[PDB]
Design a protein around this ligand. Sequence first.
Ligand SMILES: CCCCCCCCCCCCCCCCCC(=O)OC[C@H](COP(=O)(O)O)OC(=O)CCCCCCCCCCCCCCCCC
Ligand SMILES: CC(C)CCC[C@H](C)[C@H]1CC[C@H]2[C@H]3CC=C4C[C@@H](OC(=O)CCC(=O)O)CC[C@@]4(C)[C@@H]3CC[C@@]12C
Ligand SMILES: CC(C)CCC[C@H](C)[C@H]1CC[C@H]2[C@H]3CC=C4C[C@@H](OC(=O)CCC(=O)O)CC[C@@]4(C)[C@@H]3CC[C@@]12C
Ligand SMILES: *[C@@H]1O[C@H](CO)[C@@H](O[C@@H]2O[C@H](CO)[C@@H](O)[C@H](O)[C@H]2NC(C)=O)[C@H](O)[C@H]1NC(C)=O
Ligand SMILES: *[C@@H]1O[C@H](CO)[C@@H](O[C@@H]2O[C@H](CO)[C@@H](O)[C@H](O)[C@H]2NC(C)=O)[C@H](O)[C@H]1NC(C)=O
Ligand SMILES: *[C@@H]1O[C@H](CO)[C@@H](O[C@@H]2O[C@H](CO)[C@@H](O)[C@H](O)[C@H]2NC(C)=O)[C@H](O)[C@H]1NC(C)=O
Ligand SMILES: *[C@@H]1O[C@H](CO)[C@@H](O[C@@H]2O[C@H](CO)[C@@H](O)[C@H](O)[C@H]2NC(C)=O)[C@H](O)[C@H]1NC(C)=O
Ligand SMILES: N[C@@]1(C(=O)O)CCc2ccc(OCc3cccc4ccccc34)cc2C1
Lengths: 471, 464
Amino acid sequence: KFTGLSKEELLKVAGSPGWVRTRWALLLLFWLGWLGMLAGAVVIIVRAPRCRELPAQKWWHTGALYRIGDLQAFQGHGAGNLAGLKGRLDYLSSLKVKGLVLGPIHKNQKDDVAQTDLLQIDPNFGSKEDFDSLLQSAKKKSIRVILDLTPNYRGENSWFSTQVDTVATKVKDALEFWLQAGVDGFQVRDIENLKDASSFLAEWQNITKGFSEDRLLIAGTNSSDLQQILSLLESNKDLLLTSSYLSDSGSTGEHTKSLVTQYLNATGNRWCSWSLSQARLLTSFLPAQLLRLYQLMLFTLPGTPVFSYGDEIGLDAAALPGQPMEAPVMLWDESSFPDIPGAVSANMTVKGQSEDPGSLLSLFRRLSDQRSKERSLLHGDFHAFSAGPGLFSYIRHWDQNERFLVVLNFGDVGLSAGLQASDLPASASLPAKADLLLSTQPGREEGSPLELERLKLEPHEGLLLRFPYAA
Amino acid sequence: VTLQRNITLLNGVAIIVGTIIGSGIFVTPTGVLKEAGSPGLALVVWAACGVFSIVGALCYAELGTTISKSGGDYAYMLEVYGSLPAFLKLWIELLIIRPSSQYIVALVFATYLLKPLFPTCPVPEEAAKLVACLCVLLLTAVNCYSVKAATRVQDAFAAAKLLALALIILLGFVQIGKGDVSNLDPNFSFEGTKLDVGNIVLALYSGLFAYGGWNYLNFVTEEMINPYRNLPLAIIISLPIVTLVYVLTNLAYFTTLSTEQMLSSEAVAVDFGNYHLGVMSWIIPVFVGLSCFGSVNGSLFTSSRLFFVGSREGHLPSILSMIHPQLLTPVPSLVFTCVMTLLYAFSKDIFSVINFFSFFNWLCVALAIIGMIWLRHRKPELERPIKVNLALPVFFILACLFLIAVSFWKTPVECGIGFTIILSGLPVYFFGVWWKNKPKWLLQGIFSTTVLCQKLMQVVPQET
Ligand SMILES: CCCCCCCCCCCCCCCCCC(=O)OC[C@H](COP(=O)(O)O)OC(=O)CCCCCCCCCCCCCCCCC
Ligand SMILES: CC(C)CCC[C@H](C)[C@H]1CC[C@H]2[C@H]3CC=C4C[C@@H](OC(=O)CCC(=O)O)CC[C@@]4(C)[C@@H]3CC[C@@]12C
Ligand SMILES: CC(C)CCC[C@H](C)[C@H]1CC[C@H]2[C@H]3CC=C4C[C@@H](OC(=O)CCC(=O)O)CC[C@@]4(C)[C@@H]3CC[C@@]12C
Ligand SMILES: *[C@@H]1O[C@H](CO)[C@@H](O[C@@H]2O[C@H](CO)[C@@H](O)[C@H](O)[C@H]2NC(C)=O)[C@H](O)[C@H]1NC(C)=O
Ligand SMILES: *[C@@H]1O[C@H](CO)[C@@H](O[C@@H]2O[C@H](CO)[C@@H](O)[C@H](O)[C@H]2NC(C)=O)[C@H](O)[C@H]1NC(C)=O
Ligand SMILES: *[C@@H]1O[C@H](CO)[C@@H](O[C@@H]2O[C@H](CO)[C@@H](O)[C@H](O)[C@H]2NC(C)=O)[C@H](O)[C@H]1NC(C)=O
Ligand SMILES: *[C@@H]1O[C@H](CO)[C@@H](O[C@@H]2O[C@H](CO)[C@@H](O)[C@H](O)[C@H]2NC(C)=O)[C@H](O)[C@H]1NC(C)=O
Ligand SMILES: N[C@@]1(C(=O)O)CCc2ccc(OCc3cccc4ccccc34)cc2C1
């Protein structure tokens, strides 16, 4: 029309032979190029390796457990009943705990065996109806409830030293009673005082699994010997066991590294629980300068971390006047500890530490959401490797997600890292430049990538570097 | 030889519904919940974007019945503001706006159709790029074959995506029919509403992405059977259906998952299928791909017709707007659309072009509606079958100017780059359009390549 031909000229010029063959050849060439692109997409899709299948986790695989042994000392005086515990479930949801090990609330008088009853509630905590309301209130907050069924919890010998059979007989009915009531698990402590111990846990684990597969059973010892632990873990393998295996030592890092790796080796990389005791705080075994390092360690090891109440604020029992070491008072606000008024401080309480970004509670909250969200920390693979003389370094990696690298300094001198990897699998080998997610000590800005060659660590520092799946 | 009108009322309804309901209902809710904080603020954002799009569609129905020529939102600016702003709109609407909008939906199609082979895993990227290019090439071949075939494709895929969203909605209804509510408590659903309207307008942009394509029947007029009735009746029927389905789909999303369950998710429809279905949960990514296929088809249709109209005004080369006889389809315009859409497959991240150019995309609509008011006052000798109440265009102009002025007030570093790319067409306008009396070194070569493309594609000029 304006820069081209018209109808008739084109129809008598572009109708000649050759041009028809040209446009038909271009048509078939276009369709063969389309089929070539389809084959190139198919052989790229089948060349992709595959992707791994998820291990079908339980609810206690996805976070931490929280032990509240003494209910009176958790809230305080005048409110130490089961009904007041409902008011703290919004605070417990800020720590992102997945379970709750309530202490033994049953009616136990004293060392007489005939008067105690594991079916009845002690009246100084409440009744059955405010327990049923507590279970339904915790069910809405996505928090499970585990009931401690240790029979003689007011006394020295915890399993009724006279005989063994009837006290183990009432536990068998108590499991079925409280499972019908609607609890999610049980705990028994001090099983080293239990005669014929390993053949009772199998029966109780059988009943607890025969009700449902989503039910837990925790056992607790005061042992530190590895073989006494493995002997209890012979026929049982889905049993959770809290002990004093890490409460022994750890002045050097090569001791803690060997203690973790030998346990994971001798067990067979099965699912375990990481703790420091069965009913004690972290401050009962560690000085105050190592409380951040062990909190970084317990949240990144392959298992379930278990804590007592007050371990997120560093609740020390010996840092106050006269008080039992089995039940310290939880420091909610500044007006918590009533007598000797003027012994608590601002950095010793919950609300004082709930604002400070460089606090201990802030570190607990920043670890407890990474543990319950990231895939290579939920069911990732573990690999430790050799490092500088005093360090503990390891890597968590699941399939193709974000890889995590933890470096810990269990010593009092400034060290260079020297991450001589040299033994990792080729899938999860170290990069040249890793990022930073947090640090235990202030004086580092978070988010900018370092490089793991001249990596320098001040004393009692812990690093949580991360790096993505690449090649 | 003309373009031979075929579009019925139901075909126009299918065009608008299939082009609007693409990928945004399956991708964007995480971005809206990230900037709103609370689910109730997300639902009021979705309803606000719905009412905004309805008001703009009524104004565009009145404009499309007034002027009634093809290539809408560009012919309406050419009628009022002359040739240079129309060329600038056509330049930007070509280069950045059309192939990136097609390539995004094609890539979402390819990503979601390959999810059952890689369930918990990142899809390999070049397989997705190749499958997206295969989608684009198949749809442009179908469009080059016939127009009735393309309308049949759009009809079938619009019905398919409607039934898919109906399935998701009825699953969300039977979940709340099981006597307990995860979300949607009368006092909990608003807990988390942040603030800072600057952090609210980004959620408004993320919601307004999912309503894009509401004015495409204005592009594809001059091919409608009885346009003066069947264009506003298509708009009125079509766009209220989208808003209701969008708010019900968000409501069904919220009663399966909690808040930060969705804030840290990757595909909220795949998780929804994982919850309410065991095996046979691949139905939902299959249906997401089937939605994005029809959306790509409708966008290719309207883009080809826009460049067809833009060639007729002497703003583009005249090899475009040449119809092929015995098929009666604009073959070189379709080839030119597909070539640009495949050319934008070289970018790594192309989602970061939306905030570079949203201000111009709403500035052109505001300019067209200002021109509509000025044409109603200046030139009242036209036949107007529909006449909107005033202060609907005035409120729409005020809302568009609010969005423009706010986008120059929170993120002004991308709008400068966007305005830098806009004025790059000003050398191009003064070479080809304004600069006549060209040398014979250039006119004979342009004539030769034009007649060569004519002999290749067997296309004649228009005139009938
Ligand atoms: C690509 C495969 C598709 C198959 C069909 C082929 C169709 C080819 C369409 C090409 C479209 C690309 C050009 C876009 C439109 C711009 C041209 C225009 O508006 O002219 C109308 C004008 C109309 O001519 P008419 O057909 O004689 O009316 O077009 C021309 O005169 C020829 C223009 C050729 C454009 C080639 C690309 C040039 C890009 C700009 C280069 C820089 C020029 C400025 C110099 C100073 C820069 C600092
Ligand atoms: C960069 C530009 C110049 C390249 C453009 C090349 C086209 C993309 C190729 C691809 C296939 C070719 C043609 C293949 C077959 C022909 C014949 C014709 O098809 C028919 O069968 C018409 C007879 C009938 O009614 O059945 C119309 C489409 C056409 C021109 C096609 C138009 C597009 C062609 C020229
Ligand atoms: C839901 C169904 C339609 C599947 C959609 C995907 C299909 C596998 C693809 C492959 C081939 C495509 C189309 C190829 C050409 C046409 C022929 C067309 O029939 C005609 O020839 C009408 C043209 C005329 O009458 O002149 C109707 C079906 C259609 C759109 C096909 C519909 C199916 C398409 C989109
Ligand atoms: C319970 O654990 C035992 C071994 O720890 C398994 O076999 C049961 O053994 C007891 C005797 O101690 C019998 O009373 C049961 O009848 C046995 N169970 C059977 C035969 O199924 C067994 O693995 C566990 N029980 C179940 C039902 O799984
Ligand atoms: C666990 O605690 C007990 C009590 O302090 C430790 O001592 C045992 O006490 C009981 C009676 O109280 C004796 O019958 C045992 O013989 C004592 N154990 C030993 C080894 O003599 C016990 O040692 C603690 N366990 C560990 C591993 O330290
Ligand atoms: C600890 O792990 C090592 C490998 O990581 C294993 O030790 C092997 O033990 C067997 C028999 O005990 C020896 O025959 C091999 O030579 C040992 N290999 C190495 C590399 O030490 C084993 O899995 C664990 N060790 C033990 C004693 O069980
Ligand atoms: C709370 O803060 C006070 C003051 O910031 C701490 O008191 C310091 O304690 C360290 C070691 O105990 C001393 O080296 C400083 O000299 C003390 N400073 C002052 C001003 O007294 C107190 O220890 C902190 N409480 C806790 C539990 O860390
Ligand atoms: N509803 C859709 C969906 O897939 O959900 C389908 C159709 C469609 C059509 C046009 C559109 O415009 C997008 C856009 C606007 C302004 C500037 C841009 C710059 C670059 C790229 C795109 C820009 C959005 C959508 C989303």
